[PDB]
Paper text:
Peptides between 37 and 43 residues in length are generated, with those of 40 (Aβ40) and 42 (Aβ42) residues in length being the most abundant. These Aβ monomers tend to aggregate into insoluble fibrils, the structure of which has been extensively studied in vitro by cryogenic-electron microscopy (cryo-EM) and solid-state nuclear magnetic resonance spectroscopy, revealing a spectrum of different polymorphs. Two human fibril polymorphs have been determined: ‘type I filaments’, which are mostly associated with sporadic Alzheimer’s disease (SAD), and ‘type II filaments’, which are observed in familial Alzheimer’s disease (FAD) and other neurodegenerative disorders with amyloid brain pathology. Here, we determined the structures of nine ex vivo Aβ fibrils from six different mouse models by cryogenic-electron microscopy.
For the APP/PS1 mice, we observed only one fibril type made of two identical LS-shaped protofilaments related by a C2 symmetry. Murine type III fibrils were determined to a resolution of 3.5 Å and 3.3 Å for APP/PS1 and ARTE10 mice, respectively. The reconstructed density of ARTE10 murine type III shows only weak carboxy-terminal density; accordingly, an atomic model was built from residues G9–V40. The amino-terminal L-turn involves residues Y10–F19 and is mainly stabilized by one hydrophobic cluster composed of Y10, V12, L17, F10, L34 and V36. The S-turn, which involves residues F20–V40/A42, is stabilized by two hydrophobic clusters: in the first half of the S-turn between F20 and K28 involving A21, V24 and I31, and the C-terminal second half of the S-turn involving A30, I32, M35, V40 (and A42). The protofilament interface involving residues D23–K28 of murine type III fibrils is stabilized by symmetric salt bridges between D23 and K28 of the opposing subunits. Although murine type III Aβ fibrils extracted from APP/PS1 and ARTE10 mice show some similarities to the human Arctic Aβ filament, their fold has not yet been observed in the brains of patients with Alzheimer’s disease.
Author numbering:
A (entry chain C), B (entry chain A), C (entry chain E), D (entry chain G), E (entry chain I), F (entry chain B), ...: 10 to 40
């Protein structure tokens, strides 16, 4: 898994109640 | 998995209750 | 898992009650 | 797990009561 | 787990009562 | 407005984020 | 507004973040 | 506003962050 | 505003951070 | 505002940080 040179902007203003995953970036795995 | 040079903008203003996944970027895996 | 040169900005202004994961960046694993 | 050269900014202004994980960055593991 | 050259800024202004984990950075482990 | 002898049962198990009104009973008015 | 003899049961188990009104009973008014 | 003989049961088990009104009973007014 | 003979039971087990009103009973007014 | 003969039970077990009003009973006014 070669992952590089990633300019990332993430906005999540108002979240009532997250019942799961909020991932800005995932290179791998299990969710 | 060669992943590079990614300019990403993500907006999620109001989220009541997320019952799953909110992924800005996923190079691989299981969700 | 080769992960490098990542300029990341993450905003989560108001969160009532998170019942899961809020990950700015995950290189791997289980969530 | 080779993880380097990561310029990261994380904002979480108001959080009522977090019932899970708020991770700025995770190189691996279980959550 | 090779983790280096990480410039990290973390903000958590007001937190009512955290019932979990608030991690600025996790190189590994169990949470 | 004569309203009487009302046996009422109301269930609302999981509500993500209510953006309006959840009224078990309204005898009148404006909503 | 004559309102009487009202046996009422109200359940709201899990609410992420209410952005409005949750009224078990309203005899009148403005909401 | 004649309001009487009201046997009321109200349950609100888990509330992340209420951004409005949770009223068991309102005889009148403005909300 | 005639309000009488009100047997009321109110439960609010866990509340992360209330950003509004939690009223067991309101005979009138402004909220 | 005639308010009488009110048998009231109120439970609020765990409250992280209340940012508003928790009123068992309000006969009137401004909140």
């Amino acid at each position: 898994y070669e992952v590089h040179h990633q300019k990332l902007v993430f906005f999540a203003e108002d979240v009532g109640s997250n019942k799961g995953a909020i991932i800005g970036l995932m290179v791998g795995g299990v969710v």
